[PDB]
Amino acid sequence: MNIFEMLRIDEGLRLKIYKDTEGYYTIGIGHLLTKSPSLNAAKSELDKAIGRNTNGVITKDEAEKLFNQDVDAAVRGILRNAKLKPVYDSLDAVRRAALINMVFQMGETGVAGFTNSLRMAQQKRWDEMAVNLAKSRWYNQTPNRAKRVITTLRTGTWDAYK
Ligand SMILES: [Cl-]
Ligand SMILES: [Cl-]
């Protein structure tokens, strides 16, 4: 198991523009296109992202390309985040994957807000951190996914994904 496989599981793969759990225009493997209610705005964003006139449909390779780019950006944004970096550095390899997933789904700013859970993570207070993470909108909105990530983060193993 690794980050790519982990997110491929949580995000799925879709070759056609679709709406995510929050109603936004997405495509590929969890690639947000826009928050605007406009399909056309979405189509515009897609062609610009791909570099061609897509007509709302992309190939697997294309999806996978956005995916690489997106994981890369998540890692890099963690590493440059003054609140995130220190947490990341303190974690083992599995737990780091979990921090990446959360950043991928909710953005750097979003995660940086989980101040209290971040302090716990850094203190290696596993069970308390998990409890706290669960008291969130993120958990109430996407509980199964959230559950998988929290377990990962709590335990440092891939059990929730096997
Ligand atoms: Cl892009
Ligand atoms: Cl879910």
UniProtKB/Swiss-Prot annotation:
CC annotations in GO: host cell cytoplasm
GO molecular function terms attached to this record: lysozyme activity
Protein name: Endolysin
EC number per UniProt: 3.2.1.17
Effect seen on changing D20 to A/N/S/T: Complete loss of enzymatic activity
Catalysed reaction equations from the record: Hydrolysis of (1->4)-beta-linkages between N-acetylmuramic acid and N-acetyl-D-glucosamine residues in a peptidoglycan and between N-acetyl-D-glucosamine residues in chitodextrins
Functional description taken from the UniProt entry: Endolysin with lysozyme activity that degrades host peptidoglycans and participates with the holin and spanin proteins in the sequential events which lead to the programmed host cell lysis releasing the mature viral particles. Once the holin has permeabilized the host cell membrane, the endolysin can reach the periplasm and break down the peptidoglycan layer.
Cystine connections: none
Protein induction: Expressed late in the viral replication.
Functional pH dependence: Optimum pH is 7.3.
Upper classification of the organism: Viruses, Duplodnaviria, Heunggongvirae, Uroviricota, Caudoviricetes
Impact upon substituting S117V: 50-fold decrease in enzymatic activity
Catalytic residues, chain numbering: E11, D20
